[PDB]
Amino acid sequence: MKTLSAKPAEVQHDWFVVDATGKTLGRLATEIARRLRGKHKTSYTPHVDTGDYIIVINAEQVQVTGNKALDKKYYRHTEFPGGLKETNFEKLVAHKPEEIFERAVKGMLPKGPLGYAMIKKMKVYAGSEHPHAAQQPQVLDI
Amino acid sequence: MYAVIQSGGKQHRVVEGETLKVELLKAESGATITFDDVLMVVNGDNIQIGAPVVAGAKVTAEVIGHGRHDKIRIIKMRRRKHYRKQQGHRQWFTELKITGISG
Amino acid sequence: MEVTAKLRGAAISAQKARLVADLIRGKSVAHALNILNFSNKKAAVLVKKALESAIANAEHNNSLDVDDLKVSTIYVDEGMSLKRIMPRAKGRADRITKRTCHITVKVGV
Amino acid sequence: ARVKRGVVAHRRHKKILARAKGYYGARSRVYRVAFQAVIKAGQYAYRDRRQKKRQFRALWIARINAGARQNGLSYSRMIDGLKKAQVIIDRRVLADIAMHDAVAFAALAEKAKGALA
Amino acid sequence: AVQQNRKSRSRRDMRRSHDALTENALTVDQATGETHRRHHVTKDGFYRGRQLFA
RNA sequence: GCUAAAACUAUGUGCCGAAGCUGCGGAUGUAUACUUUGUAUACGUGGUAGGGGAGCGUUCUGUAAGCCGAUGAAGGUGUGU
RNA sequence: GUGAGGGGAGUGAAAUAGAUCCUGAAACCGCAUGCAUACAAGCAGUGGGAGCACCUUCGUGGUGUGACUGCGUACCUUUUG
């Protein structure tokens, strides 16, 4: 029993702020998921949440390459017969920028109660302002 | 001070006064075991990492006794094939107490 | 130090008697007597008989005061069942079980 | 010589039920269900005594990767550098040092990258 | 139509979780001092002072 | 999710990766030498239908007109080993 | 309720030997205490593992529980399966 697990009462969560202007969606999402899960800390434990808080600003300025702005499709199903709804990236980014990041990061986090708890630490905002000045976030350039 | 030592095909990180269980040894109870194949010695800022080993370092320990771990049950069963067998196990160990670490 | 009374062989299902038992578990004796006196359940009569027997035992055999007593413990157990036959249609017969129960009441201060 | 089976049969069933302590529902009350449950538990234990070593090695490698990337190296480059420098400390001790002593791990990384250079 | 599996004691008790009984509304009659059921004549024939039986 | 790729072609340097191999501890089958030994070495130990070997418990008979038992047998129920 | 049933007193070595009465196992059904449980999907375990309660030789200890997490589609028969 010489390999120790991190204790939840001793975990420190730090606050960082990231600007999404001109970044590639998936290549930003992988780093965000890494830091949300806590893979960058030497006390990483699979069954304990050790990650940090990530605030995202300028969420509507994220980019995709190729023709994915018009051709990438988002689906959902209302469970009534025939209830498949469809949209694309360029309408979705104008309408609800935060749901794009939610989908992208949720697909990369684990599927379970710990994953649900981890995704609560990401805050996405369309504009350049956030209401979390009291937590004194640090600028992170990923 | 803490040191890294080899014993029983495995490695351990030890400090003075620690009690630890290793693979069964042939030494008798109350005897002294000396390790001269130290891999690493740390004292705060003073760090020594051996190329294979640290020259001149020593770790001395005392043999407390020998014993057996708790019993383990081994079960094998091939479903629908009329096959089943079982056996028990208790692994031997030796207990050591670290008395001296010198770099 | 609780005072006990038992009523064995009451002709009612324990599942039915338990509904009345948990209605008065833990209350003062006066409040429990009021509840039982104004209940319309059949098990209320039996539970009240047991409770008054327990109160009488506590007052007479142990010389306690009725004002301080409470229903500290009460539970209902299953008793011996009687087996009967009920004839059904087309020559078939079914088995009928008539259930009984035991009621235990403990009062204390 | 007529033999009755009660005592021995009761002992065997009671031992199985005692080993089935803590399971849900009929798995800890009913002999048939309990007997099936104990065998499956044994099979799982046999398999997991092998799975445990892999899981702990994965944990050590992840912690060493985090420490190396804190010191400016990747895990693979750090391992190659240590092998070239001839240090033979294993991953369990390396991960312990990475967790509990940052300065010593920094010294190890310095040695590894010096050997890589 | 009948069950394919026997129902467990846990689910049976969960179904019965809505079977508890409820107390009646009782009140002390001011005219006679006895406990009676609210809005009802007492056992000896009194209600709001007036008596039913001589 | 990915577009000077996280795609395809070619080359190179590292690493991960199995109950495979190696390390440490323990058990067992056969054979060769110790010229009893229970000892060393070598090679083995996934298994249905089947074949071979060695054992644990239960009831009754002798040993037993013995040995244990109201200072508590059998049986039941826990705990430790 | 002059009922059934019980609580005292008394007998007895023993009344949880009190009348369908030696011993009184399991399925099955209650009450009490400790812990967990009302945002989370599956043979219900297994390998890890925080917290809590009691005990304690105060411990790298014992007992109960098990948040979170990797893996994981019962048994028998009959079959190419």
XYZ file of C-alpha atoms (C1' of nucleotides) in Angstrom:
687
model
C 0.000 0.000 0.000
C 2.858 2.365 -0.797
C 1.195 4.001 -3.816
C -1.143 6.663 -2.449
C -4.363 8.086 -3.844
C -5.171 11.779 -3.725
C -7.596 12.779 -0.987
C -10.616 14.849 -2.087
C -10.364 17.075 0.993
C -6.786 18.008 0.023
C -7.347 18.798 -3.671
C -6.835 22.407 -4.789
C -8.705 23.696 -7.850
C -7.164 26.688 -9.627
C -8.932 29.117 -11.960
C -7.733 29.841 -15.501
C -9.192 31.918 -18.338
C -8.759 31.101 -22.043
C -9.611 33.235 -25.078
C -10.962 31.250 -28.035
C -10.391 33.853 -30.779
C -8.974 32.121 -33.849
C -8.404 28.706 -32.263
C -9.265 25.340 -33.776
C -12.223 23.728 -32.015
C -10.975 20.185 -31.419
C -7.361 21.122 -30.754
C -8.538 23.520 -28.054
C -11.006 20.942 -26.725
C -8.381 18.253 -26.131
C -6.286 20.550 -23.933
C -9.363 21.791 -22.072
C -10.411 18.201 -21.347
C -6.896 17.334 -20.169
C -6.852 20.183 -17.667
C -10.427 19.513 -16.543
C -9.543 15.891 -15.811
C -6.281 16.764 -14.065
C -3.853 14.809 -16.244
C -1.224 17.542 -15.771
C -0.730 16.975 -12.020
C 1.602 14.466 -10.373
C -1.161 13.603 -7.881
C -3.499 12.412 -10.650
C -5.876 9.676 -9.496
C -8.413 7.990 -11.811
C -11.268 7.941 -9.283
C -10.689 11.441 -7.837
C -11.383 14.794 -9.494
C -8.112 16.755 -9.476
C -8.608 19.146 -12.397
C -8.907 22.916 -12.614
C -11.568 25.473 -13.498
C -11.473 26.759 -17.085
C -13.345 29.891 -18.172
C -13.736 30.354 -21.935
C -14.306 33.780 -23.486
C -15.067 34.882 -27.052
C -16.738 31.530 -27.654
C -18.314 32.602 -30.949
C -14.899 33.258 -32.536
C -13.847 29.589 -32.645
C -13.014 28.172 -36.077
C -13.259 24.988 -38.121
C -11.306 24.118 -41.255
C -12.357 22.887 -44.673
C -16.085 23.158 -45.352
C -17.157 22.145 -41.843
C -18.769 25.534 -41.174
C -21.626 24.602 -43.519
C -21.298 20.820 -43.738
C -20.874 19.727 -40.109
C -24.236 18.592 -38.762
C -25.683 18.447 -35.248
C -28.531 16.046 -34.506
C -30.933 15.445 -31.672
C -33.998 13.250 -31.249
C -37.137 14.148 -29.426
C -38.392 10.709 -28.559
C -41.648 11.139 -30.503
C -41.911 9.248 -33.811
C -40.233 11.196 -36.594
C -38.693 13.656 -34.140
C -35.168 14.046 -35.508
C -33.962 17.666 -35.433
C -30.943 18.866 -37.406
C -28.755 21.971 -37.524
C -25.284 22.971 -38.683
C -22.212 24.607 -37.209
C -22.632 28.108 -38.628
C -26.194 28.533 -37.357
C -25.389 26.884 -34.033
C -22.387 29.139 -33.390
C -24.496 32.246 -33.991
C -27.363 30.961 -31.835
C -25.861 29.018 -28.890
C -22.042 29.144 -28.793
C -21.798 27.362 -25.428
C -23.483 24.164 -26.621
C -20.755 23.600 -29.225
C -18.099 23.569 -26.508
C -20.361 21.457 -24.303
C -20.678 18.797 -27.006
C -16.984 18.862 -27.913
C -15.718 18.541 -24.333
C -18.425 16.091 -23.241
C -17.391 13.757 -26.041
C -13.837 13.721 -24.668
C -14.623 13.355 -20.973
C -15.538 10.009 -19.330
C -19.203 8.963 -19.265
C -20.273 8.667 -15.643
C -20.931 10.559 -12.405
C -17.293 11.644 -12.174
C -17.457 12.944 -15.744
C -20.640 14.860 -14.959
C -18.880 16.419 -11.972
C -15.805 17.247 -14.073
C -17.740 19.044 -16.803
C -19.271 21.375 -14.200
C -15.904 23.149 -13.925
C -16.011 24.652 -17.444
C -17.717 28.037 -17.915
C -18.326 29.264 -21.473
C -19.270 32.821 -22.439
C -19.954 34.326 -25.851
C -18.557 37.817 -25.273
C -15.314 39.092 -23.779
C -16.616 39.470 -20.202
C -17.160 36.924 -17.436
C -18.765 37.311 -13.995
C -16.045 35.431 -12.076
C -13.733 38.320 -11.165
C -13.982 37.324 -7.492
C -12.081 34.085 -8.155
C -9.117 35.934 -9.728
C -8.516 33.661 -12.747
C -5.083 33.520 -14.365
C -4.544 33.934 -18.097
C -3.773 30.563 -19.687
C -2.577 30.330 -23.296
C -3.447 26.920 -24.709
C 17.338 11.094 4.711
C 15.711 8.431 2.591
C 17.211 5.717 0.419
C 16.253 3.353 -2.395
C 17.142 -0.331 -2.005
C 16.689 -3.607 -3.894
C 15.350 -6.808 -2.347
C 13.454 -9.812 -3.650
C 13.302 -8.677 -7.259
C 11.607 -5.416 -6.252
C 12.621 -1.964 -5.032
C 11.757 -0.017 -1.894
C 12.066 3.553 -0.636
C 12.933 3.538 3.057
C 13.614 5.908 5.948
C 15.134 5.274 9.363
C 12.934 3.272 11.717
C 10.647 1.886 9.013
C 9.317 -1.670 9.261
C 8.718 -3.451 5.970
C 7.930 -6.903 4.595
C 10.025 -8.374 1.774
C 10.371 -11.752 0.076
C 11.511 -14.589 2.321
C 15.196 -14.471 3.274
C 17.513 -17.107 4.718
C 18.799 -14.898 7.546
C 17.867 -15.725 11.136
C 15.825 -13.601 13.520
C 17.834 -10.911 15.274
C 20.509 -10.842 12.576
C 21.685 -7.753 10.708
C 21.332 -7.348 6.944
C 23.426 -4.783 5.084
C 22.513 -3.436 1.639
C 25.469 -2.077 -0.341
C 23.592 -1.696 -3.655
C 21.806 1.568 -2.848
C 20.327 3.274 -5.908
C 19.568 6.720 -4.487
C 20.162 8.725 -1.303
C 18.348 11.987 -0.540
C 18.925 14.406 2.357
C 16.938 17.555 1.683
C 19.029 19.320 -0.939
C 21.823 16.725 -1.027
C 20.883 14.310 -3.819
C 22.892 11.284 -4.963
C 21.657 9.095 -7.823
C 23.840 6.091 -8.515
C 24.926 5.434 -12.080
C 23.970 1.833 -11.475
C 24.527 2.353 -7.728
C 25.867 4.901 -5.242
C 29.445 4.135 -4.223
C 30.009 3.986 -0.474
C 26.355 4.127 0.577
C 25.002 1.608 3.079
C 21.631 0.637 4.533
C 21.558 -1.537 7.657
C 18.448 -3.329 8.905
C 17.518 -5.922 11.519
C 15.559 -9.124 10.900
C 12.424 -9.243 13.057
C 10.955 -12.577 11.981
C 9.228 -14.614 9.302
C 5.571 -15.263 8.624
C 2.846 -16.055 6.119
C 0.294 -13.726 4.556
C -3.457 -14.248 4.649
C -4.935 -17.174 2.748
C -5.953 -16.783 -0.906
C -8.469 -19.044 -2.661
C -7.887 -20.121 -6.271
C -10.990 -21.203 -8.206
C -11.203 -22.476 -11.789
C -14.432 -23.464 -13.544
C -15.277 -24.129 -17.198
C -19.027 -23.717 -17.612
C -21.003 -26.517 -19.323
C -17.833 -28.666 -19.491
C -17.909 -30.643 -16.206
C -14.629 -29.163 -14.941
C -13.773 -27.517 -11.618
C -10.744 -27.392 -9.319
C -9.614 -25.373 -6.297
C -6.549 -24.705 -4.153
C -5.321 -22.415 -1.379
C -2.201 -20.279 -0.977
C -0.232 -18.422 1.719
C 2.906 -16.538 0.667
C 5.972 -16.376 2.916
C 7.596 -13.084 3.903
C 10.421 -11.663 6.011
C 10.076 -8.584 8.220
C 12.861 -5.994 8.435
C 13.436 -2.879 10.539
C 15.672 -0.164 9.104
C 18.297 0.896 11.645
C 20.819 2.927 9.635
C 21.109 4.854 6.383
C 24.482 6.326 5.414
C 25.400 8.047 2.165
C -37.583 -1.240 32.867
C -40.587 -1.904 30.652
C -43.825 -3.699 31.542
C -45.054 -6.228 28.992
C -48.395 -7.617 27.863
C -49.034 -10.251 25.194
C -52.156 -11.178 23.221
C -51.689 -14.491 21.428
C -53.975 -16.083 18.871
C -55.821 -12.952 17.774
C -57.908 -13.810 14.704
C -56.607 -11.178 12.298
C -53.781 -10.890 9.788
C -50.512 -9.477 11.104
C -50.260 -7.274 8.015
C -53.594 -5.698 8.963
C -52.668 -5.327 12.645
C -49.342 -3.647 11.857
C -51.122 -0.661 10.305
C -52.644 0.112 13.703
C -49.416 -0.748 15.543
C -47.273 1.843 13.743
C -50.061 4.384 14.273
C -49.409 4.407 18.037
C -45.771 3.283 18.300
C -43.903 5.760 20.484
C -46.770 7.898 21.806
C -48.125 8.727 25.245
C -50.639 6.274 26.683
C -53.476 8.816 26.858
C -52.946 9.880 23.241
C -52.772 6.250 22.105
C -55.983 5.429 23.971
C -57.746 8.349 22.284
C -56.550 7.229 18.843
C -57.657 3.639 19.450
C -61.003 4.698 20.925
C -61.874 6.726 17.841
C -60.388 4.392 15.209
C -62.768 2.393 13.016
C -60.343 -0.490 12.375
C -61.030 -3.962 13.743
C -57.429 -4.299 14.945
C -57.968 -1.233 17.143
C -60.086 -3.250 19.593
C -57.393 -5.916 20.011
C -54.531 -3.423 20.298
C -56.520 -1.479 22.890
C -57.128 -4.658 24.891
C -53.393 -5.372 24.933
C -52.511 -1.776 25.849
C -54.958 -1.619 28.763
C -53.673 -4.972 30.011
C -50.115 -3.608 29.935
C -51.129 -0.415 31.754
C -52.908 -2.444 34.438
C -49.844 -4.658 34.893
C -47.593 -1.605 35.201
C -49.892 0.030 37.749
C -50.560 -3.023 39.921
C -47.562 -5.369 39.742
C -44.907 -2.627 39.575
C -46.602 0.369 41.290
C -45.823 2.884 38.545
C -47.691 6.079 37.669
C -49.932 6.107 34.599
C -49.196 9.780 33.917
C -45.572 9.166 32.926
C -46.014 6.035 30.796
C -45.379 5.833 27.050
C -45.611 3.136 24.395
C -41.920 2.261 24.254
C -42.087 -0.972 22.235
C -44.763 -2.671 20.132
C -44.636 -5.260 17.355
C -46.883 -7.886 15.778
C -45.831 -11.435 14.886
C -47.424 -14.216 12.857
C -49.395 -16.994 14.532
C -50.564 -20.463 13.609
C -52.776 -20.641 10.516
C -55.865 -22.745 9.840
C -56.232 -24.631 6.550
C -59.558 -24.847 4.718
C -60.887 -25.885 1.310
C -62.791 -23.654 -1.110
C -64.493 -25.386 -4.070
C -64.053 -23.634 -7.417
C -65.652 -24.147 -10.816
C -65.277 -27.323 -12.895
C -64.350 -29.563 -9.964
C -61.223 -27.687 -8.859
C -60.409 -27.031 -5.200
C -58.267 -24.273 -3.690
C -56.612 -23.995 -0.287
C -57.637 -21.167 2.041
C -55.418 -19.904 4.864
C -56.969 -18.179 7.893
C -54.217 -16.224 9.619
C -53.714 -15.199 13.250
C -51.179 -12.997 15.015
C -49.502 -12.254 18.348
C -49.427 -8.692 19.713
C -46.753 -7.554 22.186
C -46.969 -4.197 23.984
C -44.340 -2.735 26.315
C -44.934 0.425 28.349
C -42.328 2.446 30.207
C -41.561 5.843 31.663
C -25.406 -49.762 8.208
C -27.877 -46.990 7.410
C -26.316 -43.527 7.102
C -28.147 -40.242 7.644
C -26.922 -37.192 5.724
C -28.195 -34.324 7.852
C -25.160 -33.206 9.843
C -22.614 -33.212 7.007
C -25.056 -31.677 4.528
C -25.942 -28.920 6.997
C -22.260 -28.179 7.611
C -21.510 -27.846 3.883
C -24.499 -25.592 3.217
C -23.697 -23.437 6.245
C -20.102 -22.944 5.092
C -21.271 -21.817 1.645
C -23.805 -19.417 3.158
C -21.141 -18.038 5.506
C -18.884 -17.303 2.544
C -21.835 -15.580 0.831
C -22.176 -12.932 3.570
C -23.023 -9.427 2.384
C -24.661 -10.153 -0.980
C -28.024 -8.794 -2.070
C -31.324 -10.591 -1.657
C -31.453 -14.324 -2.267
C -27.717 -14.365 -3.009
C -27.054 -14.412 0.749
C -30.070 -16.479 1.858
C -30.807 -19.210 -0.704
C -28.282 -22.015 -1.081
C -28.562 -22.457 -4.857
C -28.190 -18.759 -5.683
C -25.489 -18.309 -3.041
C -23.491 -21.256 -4.379
C -23.532 -19.853 -7.906
C -22.432 -16.468 -6.539
C -19.361 -17.749 -4.664
C -17.871 -19.525 -7.700
C -18.247 -16.404 -9.845
C -16.550 -14.350 -7.129
C -13.616 -16.765 -7.171
C -13.306 -16.537 -10.954
C -13.364 -12.736 -10.789
C -10.676 -12.713 -8.095
C -8.445 -14.971 -10.197
C -8.765 -12.643 -13.199
C -8.301 -9.450 -11.199
C -5.102 -10.646 -9.532
C -3.672 -10.313 -13.044
C -5.490 -7.089 -13.944
C -4.184 -5.287 -10.834
C -0.558 -5.186 -12.006
C -1.498 -3.609 -15.341
C -3.714 -1.004 -13.681
C -1.020 0.086 -11.234
C 1.638 0.268 -13.946
C -0.685 2.524 -15.949
C -1.118 4.792 -12.919
C 2.648 5.055 -12.393
C 3.245 5.874 -16.058
C 0.628 8.637 -15.973
C 2.189 10.264 -12.902
C 5.690 10.067 -14.397
C 4.356 11.661 -17.589
C 2.910 14.556 -15.596
C 6.195 15.123 -13.758
C 8.262 14.943 -16.940
C 6.027 17.449 -18.717
C 6.350 19.719 -15.700
C 10.141 19.506 -16.125
C 10.041 19.987 -19.905
C 10.334 16.385 -21.136
C 7.939 13.767 -22.390
C 7.570 10.384 -20.712
C 9.174 8.441 -23.566
C 12.126 10.814 -23.852
C 12.663 10.766 -20.081
C 12.622 6.959 -19.971
C 15.063 6.748 -22.888
C 17.337 9.305 -21.234
C 17.361 7.416 -17.941
C 18.146 4.170 -19.765
C 21.050 5.868 -21.536
C 22.268 7.364 -18.238
C 22.088 3.793 -16.793
C 19.740 4.628 -13.890
C 17.694 1.532 -13.054
C 15.121 2.984 -10.660
C 11.733 1.494 -11.487
C 8.454 3.223 -12.283
C 6.881 2.649 -8.867
C 9.663 4.514 -7.057
C 9.786 7.125 -9.825
C 6.068 7.847 -9.424
C 6.400 7.975 -5.635
C 9.190 10.552 -5.952
C 7.197 12.494 -8.550
C 4.252 12.701 -6.151
C 6.096 13.508 -2.943
C 9.424 15.210 -3.815
C 9.525 17.688 -6.698
C 13.195 18.649 -6.267
C 14.478 15.074 -6.515
C 12.357 14.451 -9.607
C 13.778 17.632 -11.134
C 17.277 16.281 -10.484
C 16.357 12.982 -12.159
C 14.981 14.845 -15.181
C 18.153 16.937 -15.373
C 20.217 13.741 -15.413
C 18.020 12.195 -18.112
C 18.154 15.211 -20.420
C 21.894 15.557 -19.850
C 22.308 11.969 -21.011
C 20.008 12.639 -23.975
C 22.150 15.625 -24.982
C -51.362 -12.649 -17.781
C -48.991 -13.402 -14.906
C -45.504 -12.503 -13.708
C -42.453 -14.035 -15.364
C -40.314 -13.470 -12.249
C -41.180 -13.433 -8.564
C -41.208 -9.958 -7.048
C -38.607 -9.162 -4.414
C -39.376 -8.115 -0.850
C -37.770 -4.728 -1.520
C -40.169 -3.913 -4.366
C -43.118 -5.255 -2.363
C -42.298 -2.915 0.527
C -41.749 -0.044 -1.908
C -45.279 -0.568 -3.211
C -46.611 -0.640 0.350
C -44.804 2.637 1.187
C -48.156 4.448 0.660
C -50.290 2.397 3.074
C -49.881 4.308 6.357
C -52.935 5.295 8.387
C -53.914 8.774 9.554
C -55.284 10.181 12.807
C -58.781 11.607 13.142
C -59.617 15.167 14.179
C -60.329 15.133 17.917
C -61.267 18.059 20.136
C -62.091 18.639 23.803
C -65.747 19.617 24.172
C -65.972 22.746 26.311
C -69.467 22.120 27.701
C -68.717 18.679 29.173
C -64.906 18.457 29.132
C -64.766 15.108 27.325
C -62.770 14.332 24.204
C -65.055 13.959 21.193
C -64.765 13.776 17.427
C -64.880 17.239 15.871
C -68.301 18.307 14.514
C -69.913 15.197 16.055
C -72.247 14.560 18.966
C -70.513 13.035 21.972
C -71.204 9.466 23.062
C -73.596 10.638 25.803
C -75.607 12.981 23.579
C -74.148 16.489 23.925
C -73.380 18.967 21.154
C -72.732 22.707 21.571
C -74.442 22.716 24.951
C -77.758 21.245 23.842
C -78.474 17.686 25.000
C -80.365 15.098 22.959
C -81.468 12.572 25.611
C -83.248 13.454 28.856
C -13.371 15.461 -33.263
C -9.241 15.829 -37.413
C -7.097 19.420 -43.493
C 1.524 22.326 -44.106
C -3.759 16.116 -40.330
C -5.109 13.198 -35.674
C -5.460 11.247 -43.943
C -2.053 8.581 -47.779
C 3.326 7.289 -49.584
C 8.671 6.585 -47.957
C 12.511 6.660 -44.272
C 14.363 7.092 -39.042
C 14.602 7.609 -33.678
C 11.966 6.539 -28.902
C 7.946 4.579 -26.157
C 3.223 1.724 -24.850
C 1.526 -2.933 -25.107
C -0.243 -10.366 -23.136
C -1.499 -15.156 -18.117
C 4.698 -14.905 -24.038
C 10.123 -14.157 -21.938
C 13.185 -12.493 -17.559
C 13.640 -11.477 -11.953
C 12.384 -13.114 -6.551
C 9.538 -16.663 -3.330
C 6.665 -21.464 -3.036
C 4.432 -26.539 -4.706
C 4.431 -30.923 -7.583
C 5.471 -35.361 -11.866
C 9.446 -38.144 -14.377
C 14.526 -39.230 -15.083
C 20.105 -39.182 -13.757
C 23.718 -39.075 -9.684
C 23.983 -39.096 -3.915
C 25.945 -45.709 -4.259
C 18.779 -45.975 2.496
C 18.379 -41.131 2.368
C 14.764 -36.847 0.986
C 18.693 -34.672 -1.171
C 20.951 -31.817 -5.909
C 20.606 -31.323 -11.272
C 17.560 -31.626 -16.049
C 13.085 -31.614 -18.470
C 7.824 -30.992 -17.597
C 2.680 -29.417 -14.834
C -4.477 -25.794 -20.486
C -7.941 -29.725 -21.031
C -14.198 -32.643 -22.869
C -15.088 -38.266 -23.790
C -11.983 -41.622 -21.421
C -7.569 -44.409 -18.732
C -4.196 -44.456 -14.270
C -2.600 -42.971 -9.010
C -3.430 -41.008 -3.928
C -6.756 -39.313 -0.208
C -11.062 -36.627 3.288
C -15.412 -37.212 5.829
C -20.299 -40.467 7.477
C -22.952 -45.160 10.004
C -21.876 -50.021 12.268
C -18.095 -54.511 14.417
C -13.271 -55.719 17.178
C -9.293 -53.341 19.997
C -13.102 -51.428 24.474
C -15.193 -54.436 31.774
C -10.196 -49.581 28.013
C -10.305 -43.709 27.507
C -13.531 -38.861 27.938
C -18.283 -37.077 30.572
C -23.463 -33.438 35.510
C -16.507 -29.525 37.567
C -21.519 -30.893 31.546
C -21.638 -35.849 26.078
C -24.282 -35.603 21.441
C -26.820 -31.841 18.779
C -27.537 -26.130 17.767
C -25.151 -21.055 17.360
C -20.622 -17.510 17.187
C -15.309 -16.514 17.402
C -10.042 -17.711 16.647
C -6.614 -20.766 14.349
C -67.052 -10.297 28.280
C -67.275 -14.741 35.083
C -64.357 -15.468 27.378
C -59.485 -16.038 24.917
C -54.849 -14.360 26.370
C -51.434 -12.463 29.666
C -48.759 -10.018 34.297
C -47.552 -11.114 39.439
C -47.400 -14.912 43.493
C -46.314 -20.189 44.322
C -44.091 -25.515 42.778
C -39.955 -27.450 40.673
C -32.738 -28.608 39.779
C -34.857 -26.181 35.313
C -41.462 -22.782 33.560
C -37.777 -19.411 27.007
C -39.683 -27.801 31.063
C -46.949 -24.648 31.514
C -50.265 -28.595 28.636
C -49.631 -30.233 20.195
C -45.130 -28.838 26.760
C -36.947 -32.673 25.524
C -33.563 -30.331 21.850
C -35.941 -26.177 18.482
C -31.858 -25.891 12.390
C -33.547 -23.544 7.302
C -36.913 -21.314 4.000
C -40.351 -17.157 5.428
C -42.063 -12.654 8.582
C -41.168 -8.422 12.542
C -38.859 -4.684 16.078
C -34.037 -2.042 17.474
C -29.036 0.170 16.580
C -24.670 1.675 12.975
C -23.500 3.175 7.885
C -25.154 4.079 2.862
C -29.231 5.840 -0.424
C -34.075 10.687 -3.951
C -29.146 13.675 -11.494
C -28.599 8.340 -11.970
C -28.939 3.111 -16.664
C -27.784 -3.492 -17.281
C -26.082 -11.406 -14.111
C -25.579 -7.071 -8.736
C -19.774 -9.265 -8.140
C -14.565 -8.437 -8.298
C -9.603 -5.323 -7.983
C -8.916 -0.418 -5.968
C -10.669 3.377 -2.520
C -12.346 8.563 0.517
C -15.481 9.355 4.502
C -18.316 7.901 8.927
C -19.670 4.891 13.729
C -17.972 1.639 17.595
C -13.767 -0.956 19.867
C -8.774 -0.279 20.919
C -2.627 -2.899 22.973
C -3.788 4.199 20.184
C -1.542 1.268 15.328
C 1.371 0.537 9.085
C -4.639 -2.230 14.469
C -10.003 -4.732 14.716
C -15.472 -4.751 13.417
C -19.774 -2.629 10.384
C -20.832 0.310 6.056
C -19.112 1.570 0.953
C -19.339 7.762 -2.023
C -16.195 7.470 -6.592
C -13.638 4.091 -10.138
C -11.112 -0.250 -14.133
C -13.156 -5.113 -15.705
C -17.418 -8.058 -16.016
C -24.148 -10.997 -20.552
C -26.343 -16.928 -14.250
C -26.228 -22.583 -13.630
C -27.288 -27.516 -15.849
C -28.233 -30.389 -20.274
C -27.698 -31.077 -25.477
C -24.856 -29.652 -29.461
C -20.588 -27.857 -35.170
C -21.907 -23.999 -32.096
